[PDB]
Enzyme design. Sequence first.
Site, PDB file in Angstrom:
ATOM      1  N   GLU A  27      -3.187  -3.090   1.053  1.00  0.00           N
ATOM      2  CA  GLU A  27      -2.707  -2.500  -0.200  1.00  0.00           C
ATOM      3  C   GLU A  27      -2.021  -1.145   0.001  1.00  0.00           C
ATOM      4  O   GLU A  27      -0.974  -0.895  -0.597  1.00  0.00           O
ATOM      5  CB  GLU A  27      -3.847  -2.362  -1.215  1.00  0.00           C
ATOM      6  CG  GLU A  27      -3.484  -1.659  -2.524  1.00  0.00           C
ATOM      7  CD  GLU A  27      -2.319  -2.301  -3.265  1.00  0.00           C
ATOM      8  OE1 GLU A  27      -2.094  -3.521  -3.109  1.00  0.00           O
ATOM      9  OE2 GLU A  27      -1.637  -1.584  -4.028  1.00  0.00           O
ATOM     10  N   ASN A  31       2.353  -0.186  -0.219  1.00  0.00           N
ATOM     11  CA  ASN A  31       3.022   0.950  -0.870  1.00  0.00           C
ATOM     12  C   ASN A  31       4.066   1.596   0.043  1.00  0.00           C
ATOM     13  O   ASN A  31       5.160   1.958  -0.405  1.00  0.00           O
ATOM     14  CB  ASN A  31       2.013   2.012  -1.313  1.00  0.00           C
ATOM     15  CG  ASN A  31       1.241   1.608  -2.548  1.00  0.00           C
ATOM     16  OD1 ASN A  31       1.514   2.099  -3.643  1.00  0.00           O
ATOM     17  ND2 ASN A  31       0.271   0.716  -2.384  1.00  0.00           N
ATOM     18  N   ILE A  79      -0.915   7.952  -9.928  1.00  0.00           N
ATOM     19  CA  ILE A  79      -0.834   6.745  -9.088  1.00  0.00           C
ATOM     20  C   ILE A  79      -2.209   6.416  -8.480  1.00  0.00           C
ATOM     21  O   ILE A  79      -2.604   5.249  -8.420  1.00  0.00           O
ATOM     22  CB  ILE A  79       0.227   6.891  -7.960  1.00  0.00           C
ATOM     23  CG1 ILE A  79       1.644   7.059  -8.538  1.00  0.00           C
ATOM     24  CG2 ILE A  79       0.204   5.695  -7.006  1.00  0.00           C
ATOM     25  CD1 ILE A  79       2.240   5.853  -9.235  1.00  0.00           C
ATOM     26  N   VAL A  82      -4.995   5.618 -11.919  1.00  0.00           N
ATOM     27  CA  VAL A  82      -4.686   4.735 -13.062  1.00  0.00           C
ATOM     28  C   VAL A  82      -4.168   3.376 -12.580  1.00  0.00           C
ATOM     29  O   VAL A  82      -3.296   3.313 -11.713  1.00  0.00           O
ATOM     30  CB  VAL A  82      -3.647   5.373 -14.012  1.00  0.00           C
ATOM     31  CG1 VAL A  82      -3.492   4.547 -15.293  1.00  0.00           C
ATOM     32  CG2 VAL A  82      -4.043   6.800 -14.376  1.00  0.00           C
ATOM     33  N   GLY A  85      -2.623  -2.085  -6.805  1.00  0.00           N
ATOM     34  CA  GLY A  85      -2.519  -0.634  -7.001  1.00  0.00           C
ATOM     35  C   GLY A  85      -3.429   0.156  -6.075  1.00  0.00           C
ATOM     36  O   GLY A  85      -4.484  -0.334  -5.660  1.00  0.00           O
ATOM     37  N   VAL A  86      -3.021   1.392  -5.778  1.00  0.00           N
ATOM     38  CA  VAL A  86      -3.708   2.255  -4.797  1.00  0.00           C
ATOM     39  C   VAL A  86      -5.007   2.811  -5.380  1.00  0.00           C
ATOM     40  O   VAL A  86      -5.935   3.127  -4.637  1.00  0.00           O
ATOM     41  CB  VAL A  86      -2.825   3.445  -4.315  1.00  0.00           C
ATOM     42  CG1 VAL A  86      -3.474   4.175  -3.139  1.00  0.00           C
ATOM     43  CG2 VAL A  86      -1.449   2.974  -3.884  1.00  0.00           C
ATOM     44  N   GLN A 300      -6.859 -16.841  -8.248  1.00  0.00           N
ATOM     45  CA  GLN A 300      -6.656 -15.441  -7.865  1.00  0.00           C
ATOM     46  C   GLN A 300      -6.475 -15.222  -6.349  1.00  0.00           C
ATOM     47  O   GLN A 300      -6.005 -14.168  -5.941  1.00  0.00           O
ATOM     48  CB  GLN A 300      -7.808 -14.566  -8.393  1.00  0.00           C
ATOM     49  CG  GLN A 300      -7.387 -13.149  -8.778  1.00  0.00           C
ATOM     50  CD  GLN A 300      -6.448 -13.097  -9.976  1.00  0.00           C
ATOM     51  OE1 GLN A 300      -5.350 -12.545  -9.891  1.00  0.00           O
ATOM     52  NE2 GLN A 300      -6.872 -13.674 -11.095  1.00  0.00           N
ATOM     53  N   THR A 301      -6.858 -16.210  -5.534  1.00  0.00           N
ATOM     54  CA  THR A 301      -6.679 -16.168  -4.081  1.00  0.00           C
ATOM     55  C   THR A 301      -5.210 -16.270  -3.658  1.00  0.00           C
ATOM     56  O   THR A 301      -4.846 -15.788  -2.591  1.00  0.00           O
ATOM     57  CB  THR A 301      -7.412 -17.334  -3.391  1.00  0.00           C
ATOM     58  OG1 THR A 301      -6.864 -18.576  -3.850  1.00  0.00           O
ATOM     59  CG2 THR A 301      -8.923 -17.297  -3.663  1.00  0.00           C
ATOM     60  N   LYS A 302      -4.394 -16.940  -4.473  1.00  0.00           N
ATOM     61  CA  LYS A 302      -2.966 -17.160  -4.203  1.00  0.00           C
ATOM     62  C   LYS A 302      -2.713 -18.024  -2.956  1.00  0.00           C
ATOM     63  O   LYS A 302      -1.693 -17.881  -2.281  1.00  0.00           O
ATOM     64  CB  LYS A 302      -2.199 -15.826  -4.157  1.00  0.00           C
ATOM     65  CG  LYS A 302      -2.515 -14.908  -5.334  1.00  0.00           C
ATOM     66  CD  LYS A 302      -1.708 -13.623  -5.311  1.00  0.00           C
ATOM     67  CE  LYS A 302      -2.149 -12.694  -6.433  1.00  0.00           C
ATOM     68  NZ  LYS A 302      -1.480 -11.368  -6.360  1.00  0.00           N
TER      69      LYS A 302
HETATM   70  O1  LIG Z   1       8.698   9.224  -9.599  1.00  0.00           O
HETATM   71  C1  LIG Z   1      10.001   9.078  -9.305  1.00  0.00           C
HETATM   72  O2  LIG Z   1      10.829   9.210 -10.175  1.00  0.00           O
HETATM   73  C2  LIG Z   1      10.447   8.752  -7.899  1.00  0.00           C
HETATM   74  N1  LIG Z   1       9.298   8.403  -7.044  1.00  0.00           N
HETATM   75  C3  LIG Z   1       9.474   7.798  -5.847  1.00  0.00           C
HETATM   76  O3  LIG Z   1      10.592   7.528  -5.459  1.00  0.00           O
HETATM   77  C4  LIG Z   1       8.315   7.462  -4.994  1.00  0.00           C
HETATM   78  C5  LIG Z   1       8.344   7.738  -3.616  1.00  0.00           C
HETATM   79  C6  LIG Z   1       7.257   7.427  -2.817  1.00  0.00           C
HETATM   80  C7  LIG Z   1       6.122   6.811  -3.367  1.00  0.00           C
HETATM   81  N2  LIG Z   1       4.973   6.494  -2.627  1.00  0.00           N
HETATM   82  C8  LIG Z   1       4.911   6.036  -1.345  1.00  0.00           C
HETATM   83  O4  LIG Z   1       5.898   5.843  -0.658  1.00  0.00           O
HETATM   84  C9  LIG Z   1       3.594   5.781  -0.743  1.00  0.00           C
HETATM   85  C10 LIG Z   1       2.416   5.488  -1.392  1.00  0.00           C
HETATM   86  C11 LIG Z   1       1.419   5.339  -0.427  1.00  0.00           C
HETATM   87 BR1  LIG Z   1      -0.377   4.920  -0.852  1.00  0.00          BR
HETATM   88  C12 LIG Z   1       1.988   5.553   0.795  1.00  0.00           C
HETATM   89 BR2  LIG Z   1       1.169   5.509   2.508  1.00  0.00          BR
HETATM   90  N3  LIG Z   1       3.304   5.820   0.602  1.00  0.00           N
HETATM   91  C13 LIG Z   1       6.094   6.553  -4.744  1.00  0.00           C
HETATM   92  C14 LIG Z   1       7.174   6.863  -5.548  1.00  0.00           C
END
Ligand SMILES: O=C(O)CNC(=O)c1ccc(NC(=O)c2cc(Br)c(Br)[nH]2)cc1
Length: 357
Positions: A27, A31, A79, A82, A85-86, A300-302
Amino acid sequence: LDAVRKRPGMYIGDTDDGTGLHHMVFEVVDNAIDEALAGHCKEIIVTIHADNSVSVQDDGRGIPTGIHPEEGVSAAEVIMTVLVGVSVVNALSQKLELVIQRGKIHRQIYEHGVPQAPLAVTGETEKTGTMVRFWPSLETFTNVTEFEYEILAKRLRELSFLNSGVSIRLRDKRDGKEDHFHYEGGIKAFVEYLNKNKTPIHPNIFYFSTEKDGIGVEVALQWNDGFQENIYCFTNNIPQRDGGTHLAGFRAAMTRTLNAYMDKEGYSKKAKVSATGDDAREGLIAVVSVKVPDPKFSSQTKDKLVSSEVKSAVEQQMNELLAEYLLENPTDAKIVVGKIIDAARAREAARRAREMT
Ligand SMILES: O=C(O)CNC(=O)c1ccc(NC(=O)c2cc(Br)c(Br)[nH]2)cc1
């Protein structure tokens, strides 16, 4: 977040057999891959630390520090807190360390999803990117509590195949073991890797990548001298162990195309044999990767895709492009059909043997 801790199996996967535990890693990695798809992250480093934690470091833009007016907290906290998702990874960790380089270093610690303090600037930096390190909660995860190198290696390698040119490094600090995955050939390189210990019977791997009616269809395949079928199916980079409508469409288009070729070019007439789907599947290695905006699975396993429209999309694209491949590559076509006729002869001769006394 309290709901995630109450029913952790629902959000991350089985919390006792190791499935859930390793999905925590995947997960966070997903990201970082989304940032690499956006065109900012070039490298991802995953490290298994000696204290039974895992970190993921990317070199992307860094998670926004800019503060939310309604929530009153850093956008990175939004992020992380909420609603996979991380936040799910964060809720099920005893501790999580966030480090954002964006030209300042920002740091934050969480414990069971709750931050110890706001996202505070620790120092200065020239570099950019995000680091997330997490200690999985032993309240949540039982039995299999230690990370396993080979489980993380298998998936990160396929994630490299599945995401064009994304460098992924894996480091095990418990014993020094290292890997570097960066297959620029993509799903075509996946097939090469799957056939590296086999004997490919023809040089040109069939490949296409298309988008019709909002569905991305990407296929690579190549026959070997063996008699096994090995199709690997994916939907939005999630594997379907038990196939589904993507696999059905692939199989349908393939029997139809090869039979049509064998009929038109006069192979079936000269042989005096009628080839089936099972004859074509022998020796086949293939990867079918589809992109669906709102996919439907059996559970849910996909493990199985049930989106009916995916069958037609895959079937129609395969029919057109495999037919183009056969005509454009007549030497590959001749080798493959030669194998298929012999399989059909053997099967029909064996069926004929049972009835004849
Ligand atoms: O908010 C905006 O308008 C623009 N935002 C972005 O472009 C933007 C850029 C980078 C992230 N996050 C990651 O790359 C990430 C999460 C994890 Br967990 C790890 Br490891 N890397 C999220 C949003």
